[PDB]
Design a protein around this nucleic acid. Structure first.
Length: 192
DNA sequence: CGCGGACGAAGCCACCATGTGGGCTGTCGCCAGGC
């Protein structure tokens, strides 16, 4: 993978955030499996002005119109088990259930979000997830370009001893939780 | 030598007072639900 610090300017909506992330990468690929996760990822870091954002990626980004005045960028290749390292992350805990008139949506509170998350990591890296328990988007009018929704993210943080390296790294590259294209998924680690 | 231009010749009369005015303008919170 490879990491960059980038910052869009004029961002009014989340979908245009997605599009500004894909229009700077020409050769794009998508390798999918029926039920498993798709194989960029990204995290919103400062949103009231322009919008600074950390991107994880496979294909190299170069500045575009109204981009940075420079191409930071580093290419990284990943992490010994038993050792603790800093984590991080935004995701959307949900419960899907039959809806009157299907619906994404202990169990809310800060304890089934912790249950949900450590479910997400599973045998990979053991961690503690900052529990949130509370973003809107609409289509920019372009045909076949989504529509309008709501949503709710949660950020999580600390050091996460990993129990399987290739598989937590697998999780780092695949992403944790739905809506990866709308801010979620990216797990960030650092040595303790 | 002739014509044209310029200049000249007058008749002239002389203790103490100040006040006016009035005419041009635009703004949100967003989304969802119910009537």
């Amino acid at each position: 993978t490879w990491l960059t610090k980038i910052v869009p300017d004029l961002f009014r909506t989340a979908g245009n955030l997605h599009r500004k992330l894909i229009r700077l990468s020409s050769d794009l690929g998508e390798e999918r499996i029926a039920n498993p996760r798709q194989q960029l990822l990204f995290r919103i870091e400062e949103t009231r002005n322009e919008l600074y954002l950390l991107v994880q990626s496979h294909s190299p980004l170069r500045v575009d119109r109204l981009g940075p005045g420079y191409h930071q960028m580093r290419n990284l290749d990943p992490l010994d088990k038993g050792s603790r390292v800093r984590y991080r992350i935004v995701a959307s805990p949900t419960k899907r259930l039959g809806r009157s008139e299907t619906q994404r949506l202990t169990w809310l509170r800060g304890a089934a979000a912790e249950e949900w998350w450590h479910s997400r990591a599973a045998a990979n890296g053991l961690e503690l997830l900052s529990t949130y328990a509370q973003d809107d988007v609409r289509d920019p009018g372009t045909a076949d370009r989504s529509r309008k929704i709501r949503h709710p993210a949660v950020r999580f943080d600390g050091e996460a001893v990993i129990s399987d390296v290739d598989a937590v790294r697998h999780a780092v590259l695949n992403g944790i939780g739905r809506g990866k294209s709308y801010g979620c998924g990216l797990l960030s680690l650092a040595l303790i």
